[PDB]
Structure formats: C-alpha cells, structure tokens
Amino acid sequence: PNFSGNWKIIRSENFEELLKVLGVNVMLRKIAVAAASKPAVEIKQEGDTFYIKTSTTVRTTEINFKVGEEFEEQTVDGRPCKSLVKWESENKMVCEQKLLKGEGPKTSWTLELTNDGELILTMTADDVVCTKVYVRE
C-alpha cells in the first residue's frame, strides 16, 4: 500500500521511558512530551523511495531514503547513525540503526500500515518499546 500522507498522532505509549534508556536528561525529557507532543508526520512515498518529515512546534527533521540502501539520520536522542530499511512484509518496513561514533543502546524503528489506514510506528532501545499510532488528516 501507500504510506503517503499527513499523519496526526492518535495514540502514544511508553515514549518517556524510551527517552530514559537513551539517556535523555529530565530537563529535555519533560519538554519533549509537552508541546513537542504532537509530532506531525508527513510522508511522500514513491515505490521504495521515501521522504519523511517529522515536526514538532519547535523542531523539524527530514529523512530521505530508499528501501535497501544505507542512509544517515539520527537516533531519537539525537546521535548520528547509519540506517537501513527493509520490508518485513508488503505493509511493514523495519529499520536497523548503527551509531556513527561511540557506544549505546541497540536502536531500531518500524512502520506499518493497517488495512484500516492507521500508521503504526514502533521505536526500540534495548528492551524498551514505544508505540505511536497516527491517522491521516
């Protein structure tokens, strides 16, 4: 299917705790779940090529990738990393991340589209999982 759209968050579970495994301090943490608490997600998909923009009130980031080709982005706590997305199924992609510098938690993310048109994002850091669910504006 097609992941394209302007996506608004409808559910968020365990985000604060993902931030703790990544070692995000309490100052940054409390404002990260506050007004940066509607991240808006915009996706443009063409075949295996993706543009994904994630925005809060104060921050904006863009990634551009093709499935099966390495690219650079950052972990949720901001550390630069090399990423690689592959399809787990027709409706689900999985991204493995590797730090460019230093050591840290094993981090990944997944995106999947339900038959009803919900976008499910999961983010993992070692043994901690955060799930966010979006619907199209």
Please tell me the distance from the alpha carbon of residue 76 to that of residue 6, in angstroms, as a whole number.
21
Q: Which residue segments constitute the domains of the chain, with CATH numbers given? A: 1-137 (2.40.128.20)
∠ Cα 80 48 83 (to 5°)? 15
* Element of type H or E holding 26: helix 26-32
Each residue of 103-129: b (16+ CB within 10 Å) or e?
ebbebbbbbbbeeeeebbbbbbbeeee
Experimental technique used to determine this entry: X-ray
* Element of type H or E holding 5: strand 5-13
